[PDB]
Amino acid sequence: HMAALDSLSLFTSLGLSEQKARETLKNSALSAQLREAATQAQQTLVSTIDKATGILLYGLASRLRDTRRLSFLVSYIASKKIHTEPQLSAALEYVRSHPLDPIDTVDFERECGVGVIVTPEQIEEAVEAAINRHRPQLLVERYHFNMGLLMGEARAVLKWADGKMIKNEVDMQVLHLLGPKLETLSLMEQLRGEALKFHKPGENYKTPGYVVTPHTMNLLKQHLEITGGQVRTRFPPEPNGILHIGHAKAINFNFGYAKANNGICFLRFDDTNPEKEEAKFFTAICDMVAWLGYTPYKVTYASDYFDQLYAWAVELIRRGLAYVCHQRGETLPSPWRDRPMEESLLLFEAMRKGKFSEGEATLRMKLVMEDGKMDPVAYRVKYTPHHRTGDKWCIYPTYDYTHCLCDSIEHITHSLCTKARRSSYFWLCNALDVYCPVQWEYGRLNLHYAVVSKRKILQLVATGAVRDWDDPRLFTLTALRRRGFPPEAINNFCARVGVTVAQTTMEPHLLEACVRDVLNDTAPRAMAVLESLRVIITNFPADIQVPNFPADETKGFHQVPFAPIVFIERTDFKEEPEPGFKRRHTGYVIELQHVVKGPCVESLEVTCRRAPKAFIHWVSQPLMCEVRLYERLFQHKNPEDPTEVPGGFLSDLNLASLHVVDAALVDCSVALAKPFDKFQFERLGYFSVDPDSHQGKLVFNRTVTLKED
């Protein structure tokens, strides 16, 4: 096939510049082995040879002096067992070193790092390391610093990593530090930029609605100097907000899109409005971010940008596109929108110097919107002290104004939100000739039987309907963690639906379907029961082996008490042995050799057995501990917002609520357990160490059953 080419044609098809191919075909001997090397390779390779694989054969051909060994080494570069330059340079040694004719495969493979895989984190941290080690010098010489050292020290740690991959990590991490030089399926295949038809960075000008102004090209030029063409996303919650399961699509999209595309995601707190701080929720937001597996590249506040927003707001006024208004709240046309410009500067200053009462004056943009709204407000006057900038500001930018220009300041590439007013986004940035991000709207998400407004929720916790806001029948993220859901479950959940055109409301049992698939492989098994009666064998002989989990005993086994006086549930031989029942899950069938009674069924007696009625759960020498039982909080497992028109979202409080099993009987393995540990309690359900457990007192939470009707 390929062995049929003119060499100049053959060489270029292996990935050599035409320049270096003219070079090479002057070399009769090199050129000879390169054709022979490629011939062999092709015969193994089948699908025409990749260029990258070609540069490997070219090195091989041009350095192998042994040449008894060519047919050998080529086999290792056809199957891409050798596929990096230091691997190739490794084998080039091993073969120069051993002229021994028969070469050990395993000695060879191991000393070239064949099965050896190197990870982006591993390189990231190697470079990180080198940077820190030089940070002072780096900061001062800026781009004059010899970047060679970094790749050196980086290479020093990672013997078998791609040289280009290391450069690109260096190049990136340096630009972060220096700044600019001024001279279903799986989720991160689902979130590949290519699999969404989202623009490559810098190429905003290919998206629907994007306005190309006369600066847009020089603006995108500057943009790429700042960002190295990297994807940048942001996730912008309220510092006092309360994340629910909706926000899981938000988190997974924004951090995950960045992850799947080698990018970064800023946790940008929206603190434009001045409030007193409640650290309860604030830490719980960073926590929940963490909990689902994501780490913000940087954590930032909108208040960080107040100076910048104000400067830009002043430009708006000068540019005739914004004015100071004296209309109040609650759309009537404003008497002031054509007031002279110098009149607006004067008044915006006065606003800033705190000369107007809250709402006596406002800055608005001079504009009518796609949906008819006139002159949206940019700045409001607020005198409540602000948690970060203190009392420095008494005027504040509005949410719409802000997170559009914050995106621009942070040089966001993909600005992802929930449906909208996108031509009004674009308007602002083009108004100031600043860089202009691309906005994509994805579909909202709200589950049935779920009410999540922080006000509506702090209503329940302030009646006793729920214990606190991590109460396991709330669908807040912090509650589902407490309830017992594992992170991966929620992530895999969005990996079942999670596209843009959703606006899909969803039934709760559909998620717990995922929680089972995850706990059935991760949660270990122990025996216990709630309404537990005491029973005795006839007379056995005076510690059994309960495995890790049934479907594979390849983990371990926990010892569990084997002696007289074991316990079991109700829902058993209840004297009147009606139709539909059965006889243990370990030991014997325990011949029921004697029955008892009460005034009730006070207790029972049995007999041993060995070597078939059924198998139930049991606990010999058990531990005493609480187990909380939860039921779907609302009567209507559909919206409690009056689509049903119950005329009250608080009437729908379904008096089912929580059934407390007090200290009941449980196994021995569940003793070293710390909070947020998950278990399958044989033949009951899935339970999780509640945060209030400790060695002294143990408490558990019922996550979900093992099927439905």
Swiss-Prot record:
It is found in: Cytoplasm, Cytosol; Cytoplasm. One of its GO terms (cellular component) is protein-containing complex. Keywords: Acetylation, Aminoacyl-tRNA synthetase, ATP-binding, Cytoplasm, Disease variant, Epilepsy, Ligase, Nucleotide-binding, Phosphoprotein, Primary microcephaly, Protein biosynthesis. The modification N6-acetyllysine is found at residue 276. GO terms for molecular function: ATP binding; glutamine-tRNA ligase activity; protein kinase binding; protein kinase inhibitor activity. Pfam families: tRNA-synt_1c, tRNA-synt_1c_C, tRNA-synt_1c_C2, tRNA_synt_1c_R1, tRNA_synt_1c_R2. The keyword tRNA processing does not apply. L-glutamine binds at residues 270, 399. The modification N-acetylalanine is found at residue 3. InterPro entries: aa-tRNA-synth_I_CS, Gln-tRNA-synth, Gln-tRNA-synth_Ib_RNA-bd_2, Gln-tRNA-synth_Ib_RNA-bd_N, Gln-tRNA-synth_Ib_RNA-bd_N_1, Gln-tRNA-synth_Ib_RNA-bd_N_2, Gln/Glu-tRNA_Ligase, Glu/Gln-tRNA-synth. GO terms for biological process: brain development; glutaminyl-tRNA aminoacylation; negative regulation of apoptotic signaling pathway; negative regulation of DNA-templated transcription; negative regulation of stress-activated MAPK cascade; tRNA aminoacylation for protein translation. ATP binds at residues 238-240, 244-250, 418, 444-445, 452-454. The modification Phosphoserine is found at residues 71, 453. Its EC number is 6.1.1.18. A motif ('KMSKS' region) lies at residues 451-455. It catalyses: tRNA(Gln) + L-glutamine + ATP = L-glutaminyl-tRNA(Gln) + AMP + diphosphate. It is an enzyme of class 6 (ligase). Highly expressed in fetal cerebral cortex, particularly in the ventricular zone, inner subventricular zone, outer subventricular zone, and cortical plate. Changing residue 176 to A: Decreases catalytic efficiency about 60-fold. A motif ('HIGH' region) lies at residues 237-247. It is linked to Microcephaly, progressive, with seizures and cerebral and cerebellar atrophy: A severe, autosomal recessive, neurodevelopmental and neurodegenerative disorder characterized by progressive microcephaly, severe seizures in infancy, atrophy of the cerebral cortex and cerebellar vermis, and mild atrophy of the cerebellar hemispheres, resulting in profoundly delayed development and hypotonia. Glutamine--tRNA ligase. Plays a critical role in brain development. PANTHER family: GLUTAMINE--TRNA LIGASE (PTHR43097:SF4), GLUTAMINE-TRNA LIGASE (PTHR43097). Monomer. Part of a multisubunit complex that groups tRNA ligases for Arg (RARS1), Asp (DARS1), Gln (QARS1), Ile (IARS1), Leu (LARS1), Lys (KARS1), Met (MARS1) the bifunctional ligase for Glu and Pro (EPRS1) and the auxiliary subunits AIMP1/p43, AIMP2/p38 and EEF1E1/p18. Interacts with RARS1. Part of a complex composed of RARS1, QARS1 and AIMP1. Belongs to the class-I aminoacyl-tRNA synthetase family. This is Glutamine--tRNA ligase. It comes from Homo sapiens (Human). The gene is QARS1.
